[PDB]
Symmetry: C2
């Protein structure tokens, strides 16, 4: 039981994410007023209530997990159960009375696509959205930047600091910790600051949710290529990957963006870190290029796998396969 | 996977309260260790073995079964102590020492003292290798229990009533749901508390003496005891906290919420529902730390408790803007 509490407590206590979804919805009042909305993975139903506050005539809040019973309590508690109908079960088997004008959904996972609800959103787009209908958010953008992780440096430098604290020299452990903490093939979820960013962040993929065949591209892998130049000299530990989602309406050339970038206010998503096997020294204007592909795991299609091809200046092109 | 082995030892040494208490516990026994032999059980990186050499030990046998023993060998060499400290790979149950030893030092405590601990390895070494009345670092472990009103739990439960004022959406009904789920489970929760969480004078309900042969057998039957306490004042009782301390002969390392925090935090045992208590509300019962029936290394705690004149109940645990 407490796991379901934790998931949705973290979701709503995420002030940056919840305030962004509220604004993105309310700023689309013209497209939602008097219309119908489908909420995919409605969780507690808070987004469905935002839509009703934006003037929706009917909202269908679909939630497969057991929290849908809480969503109905919340909807009834707010006197909304006649417009907002929490419907249990997956969106692929639910039956709606009508096609809807808009789809809202909180679907992003760690690294965007780790155990995300994106495919269920795409199924609902195909099955239940009217042609030309609204999607909130409408797109997701993936970013990458090379990093010199200060937290990792601290973890590696820790062994050289033991002698001055406790009188025992453990500098020999630094080489051991460097190989162990970086030789693995795991995607590390942690948040970073601008001080960790070694070059200008590069957008390598954009996902337009209205696109048919976006789901068959999901199986083939979502990715792109990048190039950047380093700010200065530092040990390159690897790469940070993060995302943003964009809400239409308001202004066509500056729409509302919810971002998980280390340069922006923290979110519960933090960032996905990809560590090279060893640190690589780089200098100012060192050119780093490569390709990143977000893939479904071969064992579990819901588990995120990231294949990283990269090249650091003079050095040969290397490849590392990560998994979550 | 290699990062598991660095993080456990990084956590251990980064725990200032623990590392400094072990350091002083060893160094303050310089008279007893001077010219004596020491066995380090689960020596890991060897940091404790080197503390024993600094205390005056003529020889330290550092036994470590995991791969980190190669690092401990380098640590000893790096400190120019390869003449005094000898790292011997393998488990202490099969390792062959040249001699019985005057002293045993070991970092062995787990969460809730006995969750995936190294205690049994230490007891095996006591039987096989420790001289009569030899020195044990630490020598004993004391188990404490105290009723708690968890401030962090209340803070989490109270978040749901604040959503309406910020987002215009009432979610107060989630407070009843979160209280049922965050408490109705049967799992031991590892969390740190402060003095403001403690509802009554902490009670010592058991003590383990590492020199006693037969302590290993007793652990398999479970260890614990009775307890009685009187509440400080009005508060919702959420359950009980269990923590330990180890005593070095002269010197205590404590994991109490009233003392500086450690990486062990405390083990919290939540009741199914909050129970209102008042000043001088009597709480009594029994705590037993048991090996889990599935896994003997996994810690199980059976709690029987009685609040005021309410009926005596039982719960079985296992391990904003």
């Amino acid at each position: 039981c407490y796991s379901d509490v934790s998931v949705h407590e973290e979701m709503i206590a995420d002030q940056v994410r919840t305030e962004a979804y509220r604004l993105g919805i309310l700023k689309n009042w013209a497209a939602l007023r008097g219309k119908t909305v489908l909420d995919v993975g409605a969780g507690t139903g808070i987004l469905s209530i935002f839509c009703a506050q934006a003037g929706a005539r009917r909202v269908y809040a679909v939630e497969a997990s057991a929290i849908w019973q809480q969503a109905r309590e919340v909807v009834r508690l707010n006197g909304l159960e006649d417009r907002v109908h929490v419907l249990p079960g997956p969106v692929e088997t639910v039956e709606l009375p009508e096609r809807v004008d808009a789809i809202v959904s909180e679907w992003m996972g760690y690294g965007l696509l780790h155990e995300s609800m994106l495919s269920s959103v795409l199924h609902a787009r195909t099955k239940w959205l009217k042609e030309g209908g609204l999607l909130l958010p409408a797109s997701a953008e993936l970013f990458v930047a090379p990093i010199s992780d200060q937290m990792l440096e601290w973890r590696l430098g820790f062994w050289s600091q033991v002698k001055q604290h406790y009188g025992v020299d453990m500098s020999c452990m630094e080489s051991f910790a460097t190989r162990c903490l970086m030789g693995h093939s795991e995607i590390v979820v942690q948040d970073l600051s601008g001080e960790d960013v070694l070059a200008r962040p590069q957008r390598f993929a954009q996902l337009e949710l209205a696109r048919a065949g976006l789901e068959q591209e999901l199986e083939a892998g979502v990715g792109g290529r990048f190039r950047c130049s380093c700010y200065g000299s530092a040990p390159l530990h690897g790469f940070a990957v993060w995302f943003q989602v964009t809400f239409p309406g308001g202004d066509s050339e500056k729409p509302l963006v919810l971002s998980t970038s280390p340069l922006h206010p923290a979110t519960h998503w933090k960032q996905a870190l990809l560590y090279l096997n060893e640190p690589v020294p780089v200098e100012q204007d060192t050119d780093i290029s490569g390709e990143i592909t977000l893939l479904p795991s071969p064992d579990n299609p819901r588990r995120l796998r990231i294949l990283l091809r990269y090249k650091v200046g003079d050095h040969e092109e290397k490849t590392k396969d990560f998994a979550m």
